[PDB]
Amino acid sequence: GEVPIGDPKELNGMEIAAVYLQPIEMEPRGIDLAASLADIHLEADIHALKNNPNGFPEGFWMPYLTIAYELKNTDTGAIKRGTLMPMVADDGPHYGANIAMEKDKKGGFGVGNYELTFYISNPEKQGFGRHVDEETGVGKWFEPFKVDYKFKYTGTP
Amino acid sequence: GGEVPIGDPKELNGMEIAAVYLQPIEMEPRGIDLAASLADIHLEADIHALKNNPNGFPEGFWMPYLTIAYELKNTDTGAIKRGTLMPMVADDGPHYGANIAMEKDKKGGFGVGNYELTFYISNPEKQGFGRHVDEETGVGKWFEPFKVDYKFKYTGTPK
Ligand SMILES: [Cl-]
Ligand SMILES: [Cl-]
Ligand SMILES: [Cu+2]
Ligand SMILES: [Cu+2]
Ligand SMILES: [Fe+3]
Ligand SMILES: [Fe+3]
């Protein structure tokens, strides 16, 4: 059910990919946009690479990230921004948001060419700690960064 | 190393729940954990998904966004302290942990001896971590809050 968004990027010890699927229903209620109001569920799939410098085992989900997105229709110039929220689905933990496309009451988010940007800040922003002792410590976290994708939105799946 | 195992791990609610301690650790950011020089142990909860986890976590994955309170009771002296373990990462992965004063704590009898350790665990939804519940991609309901208990002999800081 998942449509790839552009090509994944490897950086800061992480594999960072984007996909969209049909709208999902999330609990708790009142956080994620309700499925009937949305056209897609956008997901950031973020996992540790080999030799992750912050101690995360290869393939582990990267938790406690702060992630904002910007979605730009490059045909219309229409831009929207939001946050992705941490949650779990059948395919495990990720960061996600239901997003109105055709249903965006502002308009301009229908079928077309898009640029997607993630803006990502490290887990310390949320108070997640790291050992820094000689025996068990790990390296410094990345500074906030962005990653960019280009994709064609072909309509609510 | 490695760490000192506390009691036996428990397998409950789709998770392996183990307790360990080691020497006090230095943690960043500075100021949230008790300083290493003021502590005698670093206590950890090691919690990972079992096979067939009912909440969509693949086997071996760390269970994130858990709320974990601990109670440490010296059964010889009666000394009791409580706290909450904080999520963090070390060179062998993410865990929940806290630096704790034992011998250094002069406000109680927290020296070498027999201990009961209890973890009080609440599911990730308590912290607003979400779950899909639609038919196509949804997963099972989270566990209700629960406790796990360990017995161990504290023999001092690993040296
Ligand atoms: Cl791309
Ligand atoms: Cl035990
Ligand atoms: Cu999701
Ligand atoms: Cu720790
Ligand atoms: Fe997914
Ligand atoms: Fe550990």
Q: Is B117 helix (H, G, I), strand (E, B) or coil?
A: strand
Ligand nearest, relative to CA of residue B26: 4
The two three-digit tokens of residue B92, written as one number: 């062998």
- What Å resolution does this PDB entry report? 1.6
A97: nearest Cα among A64, A77, A68:
A68
- Annotated ligand binding at A47? The verdict is no
- Considering only CB atoms, B128 lies closest to which of A21, A28, A135, namely A28
- List all residues 6 or more positions away from B102 whose beta carbon is below 8 Å from its beta carbon: B39, B40, B41, B110, B111, B154, B156, B157
Q: Are B51 and A92 in contact (CB under 8 A)?
A: no
**B130: nearest CA in chain A?**
A87
- Smallest Cβ–Cβ distance between B89 and the set A54, A86, A92 belongs to A54
Architecture in CATH of A1-157: Sandwich (2.60)
Chain A: nearest CA to B42, how far in angstroms? 11
Residues B42, B22: contact at Cβ < 8 Å? yes
Q: How does DSSP assign B7-59, residue by residue?
A: EEEEEETTEEEEEEEES---EESTTSSPPGGG-SEEEEEEEEEPTT-TTSPPT
DSSP of A68-108, one letter per residue? Answer: EEEEEETTT--EEEEE-EEEEETTEEEEEEEE-STT-TT--
Select from A52, A124, A133 the residue whose CB has the most chain B CBs within 10 Å, as the one to mutate to test that interface. A133
- A129–B1 CB contact, under 8 Å: no
Instruction: Supply B40's token pair.
Output: 């005698």
User: Interior CA angle at A87 toward A85 and A93, to 5°?
Assistant: 120
**A37 to chain B, minimum CA–CA distance in Å?**
15
CB contact under 8 A, A56 and B132: no
Q: Are A61 and B60 in contact (CB under 8 A)?
A: no
Name B14's bridge partners.
none
Residue B126 backbone phi and psi in degrees, to 5: -55, -35
The three-state secondary structure class of A37 is helix
Q: What is the distance in angstroms between the Cα of A131 and the nearest Cα belonging to chain B?
A: 5
Pick the CATH number of B1-159 from 2.40.110.10, 2.60.40.2480, 3.20.20.70, 4.10.490.10: 2.60.40.2480
Burial class (CB in 10 A: 0-12, 13-18, 19+), A38: buried
Residue pair A96/A32 in contact (Cβ under 8 Å)? The answer is yes
Of B61, B87, B93, the CB nearest to A55: B93
DSSP B54-98: TTSPPTT-B--S-EEEEEEEETTT--EEEEE-EEEEETTEEEEEE
Q: Indicate yes or no: CB of A24 within 8 angstroms of CB of B124.
A: no
Exp. method: X-ray
| Alpha-helical regions (H) of chain A | none
Q: Which amino acid is at B159?
A: K
The terminus-to-terminus CA distance of chain A in angstroms comes to 8
Contact call for B90 and A138, based on CB within 8 A: yes
